Symmetry: D2
Subunit: 252 residues, 4 copies
């Protein structure tokens, strides 16, 4: 908790032309932000161009993925350095799409968490169970494994910097949001677990946001819950609905 | 038969928008009269837009190191063909060893990227190559054939001509162990006979097959001379000015 | 609550029909009055029929080291539940580490074998256990829970009682590094609380949970004494006569 | 070529009770065999019992799989020793079912070929393309890879002992047999390749049998072809149809 976050993950969606316009629209409508942070994550291609429009502004730059090496022969990948030089503050790691479609495993993910922290950036670690896992009663152990694997090797001080995002796979793009009751139950669990790995202090420092079918007509009720520190917006982050959400987010 | 030679530079994960903007301008002027073939630079996504304008109207061409096969969608961290087409990218490396080995990218996955790149009017550069163990078992030809057949599957005579293949023996990637022009040529000749049966003589003669072991400024002359080697997919050397050297060498084989 | 202790021997890939016939007869007489618990021998498929007759009517019970979940079909090299049931097999080890690690046998695959074994009126012995790395990340409990939940999935109160679990910490398999009775007991207690939530008190108390690290004739006494350890899944020691020793020890904990 | 083989792969099909009867039926109807070999492959459970009924008889004992170690901690597996002691002469390795359902890779397979030869038994190496592979034009390279991987590390003398069985996956149990023309084309190819790896001598020594939907009303026409040295019978090997096949096999 302590400083909510409204993060938008555009995913594979905008052209440098569109980004420039859209970002500006946001920066105009939200130049005034009541401390709760607002992050926008455009694709690699449009990062530098968006960097400008944001430089010096309140809204912060976010990236969708990163490799764990400063440089090397890894054709197609982007290094932490390249993201830093552009002024990217947040980096999404472990997104369900990457885990599932691109077969990224926990170790791979864990090695990325550190790399993002090394260059003093904030990693957004994604966790979440699949419907099948939820039905077998593995919701918690699945989240627990991912979290433990994610933080493995981090000290109380680094762990404090990490951001967690619970995107229940059964609710990504399916339009089926988890009730605030279901969201909170897992968020709470993550918080308790977080403290058992460290201490009540770190656990309260780490921000855990909800992700998965975050629409304007359901965001209130999710941010209201005790342990949900904001959201990782998917679709809604592409339109102007990202403003109505940021608006609601100001209701606290 | 004629075929336009090609010299491509795969920077890989190496430069920042600054280092990039510099190096690129340098070249835009060094290789200014060079119009007898194509020099392609492939910077990281982060730095394409910048380099993109340093080339708008110049001779050197823009190329990406990877692409996803869809136009847009729920695919965090991926770049679409439309995103590359806006910036003015003309070439896209597809199926590179690193992606196949390290990022478990399979043939069917790669085949879709090939068709995808072609749909937007861009040029795929399909990479194929054996492993040391593979070559030791005599599987060089079947490893290459499988990859060529898979990659081209579904394409037709027309689309096939637009593809560019790049033979990159894995046992010669960054290990320094470049391939003797004999070895290179042998394989390139095969890939061309194969391409012949798959489609026809005309087609197999239109498709450029570049080499990719450890192309250095010294040995490169002993390769481009070969019969079935139409250019090179350069790694390291594409970083330094030695790239501008290679570009020189290649010019002394055309008229 | 009562629960009948169980001592099982997983010969693994070790004896021939001859060595087998010998060892078995030896036992049939040594452990002759032993009827306060169950001794189970698990020879390789090749040698089941032989050992099978050396037990027909005796006290010691027959057990297999693996099974496929179908009754018959196009599955070269596999053994069916019917094939085991004819010979008179009563126990079937399912989900052993070696099979999970070496032969890529997954949870869903193992769950089907559990149901299958139960259908023919036989007893599954589901093996669960963490890895050194897993225990170092504090994943012991979730690794075990996942495996227990997966394995039992679909079963009900009745069928669940018939299952026999065997906690076999992988970092203690053939490495000699047996587990302190503290560690063993801790986990066994968890697996039993879990089994309690999954079904109920009655059920969790009926299910035997055996230990399986490096059960030797000396340390075995410090384990069977524990509260939640109902017996042992013995590897090596099940080969020699030391097995007959362990069987002795276990007898001195019943009345 | 040189000494055809009629091999029956029961797969997962008989009880020790049934085996004893059935085998006997065969041993009675075929105690007289015009040199062409007849192998029967029952499941592990029934091996020793069938061993007796066959001991001293013409029909030979075959197994469906084996591990590559004489002994060790490999719960559920059977060693070469265990097969030998029972008098098993042939061992099927690399059967499509094992490759596909049980994920056995070429190395695994190759390590089994040697192990079977060590204890002086004859391994039956299975190879074959899937429909999809056949359509992409990979029929040959697929067979070539499997064969090369299978023989890797074998000398002219061991390689001579190896038996090859081409079971086109698209024809296993599908009831769709390959025409003799299609069968021969691949068999021929394997023979040419076999010689290029060794010499015309070894290539002619190695026996290559067809496998896949071998029924009595199509066996003749397959054994007739030049490079098909017999068959690996699946279903047909379970009934008495295994006798009509053995009967036809005698027509040469």
């Amino acid at each position: 908790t302590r400083k909510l976050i409204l993060a938008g993950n555009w995913k594979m969606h905008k052209t440098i032309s569109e980004a420039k316009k859209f970002v500006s629209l946001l920066v105009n409508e939200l130049h005034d932000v009541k401390e709760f942070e607002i992050v926008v994550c455009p694709p690699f291609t449009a990062l530098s161009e968006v960097g400008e429009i944001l430089s010096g502004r309140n809204i912060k730059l976010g990236a969708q993925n990163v490799f764990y090496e400063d440089q090397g022969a890894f054709t197609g990948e982007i290094s932490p350095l390249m993201l830093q030089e552009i002024g990217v503050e947040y980096v999404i790691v472990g997104h369900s799409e990457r885990r599932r479609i691109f077969k990224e495993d926990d170790e791979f993910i864990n090695r990325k968490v550190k790399a993002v922290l090394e260059k003093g950036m904030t990693p957004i670690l994604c966790v979440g169970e699949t419907l099948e896992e939820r039905e077998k009663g593995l919701t918690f152990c699945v989240v627990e494994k991912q979290v433990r694997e994610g933080f493995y090797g981090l000290d109380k001080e680094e762990a404090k910097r990490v951001v967690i995002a619970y995107e229940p796979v059964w609710a990504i793009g399916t339009g089926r949001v988890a009730t605030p009751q279901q969201a909170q139950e897992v968020h709470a669990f993550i918080r308790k677990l977080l403290s058992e790995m460290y201490d009540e202090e770190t656990a309260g420092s780490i921000r855990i946001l909800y992700g998965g079918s975050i629409k304007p007509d359901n965001f209130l009720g999710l941010i209201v819950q005790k342990d949900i520190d904001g959201g990782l917006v998917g679709g809604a982050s592409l339109k102007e609905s990202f403003i109505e959400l940021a608006r609601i987010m100001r209701g606290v």
